[PDB]
Design a protein around this ligand. Structure first.
Ligand SMILES: OCCNc1ncnc2[nH]c(-c3ccccc3)c(-c3ccccc3)c12
Length: 263
C-alpha cells in the first residue's frame, strides 16, 4: 500500500515529518523524510526494527525511493510533551507522575534489549490520542549491550541541559545512568516549568548551587518534598552512587497515589 502526503506536522532539522493518510483504509502514519554520510539514518532503521513496546513509537517500514528515505512510523496526534509544559509552572503533579511512569516503562524496555536512546527530552517524547507517552527519534540511539556484554560509550551527544555530567568529564562512561539523569531533568521540567541549568559543569552557577543543596532557589522551591527527594537521588554527580531504575520503582513519590482513572 502506498500513501498520500496530506500535511506537514513539523520540519525537524534533517528534513520534515508529514501526516501520510492512505485514501482507502484511512490508516494514519507519520513519515520522517531525511535527505541522504548515511550512517546516521541506516543505524536508526536497524534499531527501529528491534523495537516493539507500548511506550515506544512503532516502526512499520521504510522506502529507499532513490535518494529520499521515508521512515514510516506510528502517528501521535497529541504532539510533544514539551507543549504540555506551561513555562514557569509545569503541570499538575498527578499528570507528571503518570508520564514519568510511562517514560520509565519505555526506558526499562530499551535498556532491557541493550539500547540507549541518548537524547531523552520533552521534544522527543510524543503523546498519542489517549495521552500515552511514546519515546521517539532513535537517530542518536546505539547498542550498549550485545551478547550479554556491556560496552562503554565515548561519543558525546544529546542536549546540554539534559546531559549527564560524566559525559563532559570522562573519556568513557556507562550508558544507563546517562538515560536516568535525563529522565530526572524531564521530571524537573514537568514539575517546575523550567530547566535547572544550561549544563552540569562546575563553571555553571546553577549546577553548583544544586550540589550545595540550596533547594530554596528556583526551580527546586516549586516542586514539593516527595518528588524533590527522588530528584535528589537521580541528579547525583557520581554515576555509581546514582539511583537505578529498579530503585526508582521503589521510591515513595513514584508509588504515591495521586491520579484518578479514565475519564
Ligand atoms: O517519530 C518522531 C517523528 N515525529 C513524529 N512521529 C510520530 N508522530 C508524530 N506526531 C507529531 C506531531 C503531532 C502533532 C503536532 C505536531 C507534530 C510528530 C512530530 C513531527 C515533527 C516535529 C515534532 C513532532 C511526530
Amino acid at each position: 500500500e502506498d500513501w498520500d502526503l496530506v500535511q506537514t506536522l513539523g520540519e525537524g532539522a534533517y528534513g520534515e515529518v508529514q501526516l501520510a493518510v492512505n485514501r482507502v483504509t484511512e490508516e494514519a502514519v507519520a513519515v520522517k523524510i531525511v535527505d541522504m554520510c548515511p550512517e546516521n539514518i541506516k543505524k536508526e532503521i536497524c534499531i527501529n526494527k528491534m523495537l516493539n513496546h507500548e511506550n515506544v513509537v512503532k516502526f512499520y517500514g521504510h522506502r529507499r525511493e532513490g535518494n529520499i528515505q521515508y521512515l514510516f512510523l506510528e502517528y501521535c496526534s497529541g504532539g510533544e510533551l514539551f507543549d504540555r509544559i506551561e513555562p514557569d509552572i509545569g503541570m499538575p503533579e498527578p499528570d507528571a507522575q503518570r508520564f514519568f511512569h510511562q517514560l520509565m516503562a519505555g526506558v526499562v524496555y530499551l535498556h532491557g534489549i541493550g539500547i540507549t536512546h541518548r537524547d531523552i527530552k520533552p521534544e522527543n517524547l510524543l503523546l498519542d490520542e489517549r495521552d500515552n507517552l511514546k519515546i521517539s527519534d532513535f537517530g542518536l540511539a546505539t547498542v550498549f549491550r550485545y551478547n550479554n556484554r556491556e560496552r562503554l560509550l565515548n561519543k558525546m551527544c544529546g542536549t546540554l541541559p539534559y546531559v549527564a555530567p560524566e559525559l563532559l568529564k570522562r573519556r568513557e562512561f556507562h550508558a544507563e545512568p546517562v538515560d536516568v539523569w535525563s529522565c530526572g531533568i524531564v521530571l524537573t521540567a514537568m514539575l517546575a516549568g523550567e530547566l535547572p541549568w544550561d549544563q552540569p559543569s562546575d563553571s555553571c552557577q546553577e549546577y553548583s548551587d544544586w550540589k550545595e543543596k540550596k533547594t530554596y532557589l528556583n526551580p527546586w522551591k516549586k516542586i514539593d518534598s516527595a518528588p524533590l527527594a527522588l530528584l535528589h537521588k537521580i541528579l547525583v554527580e557520581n554515576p555509581s552512587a546514582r539511583i537505578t531504575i529498579p530503585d526508582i520503582k521503589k521510591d515513595r513519590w513514584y508509588n504515591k497515589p495521586l491520579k484518578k482513572g479514565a475519564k
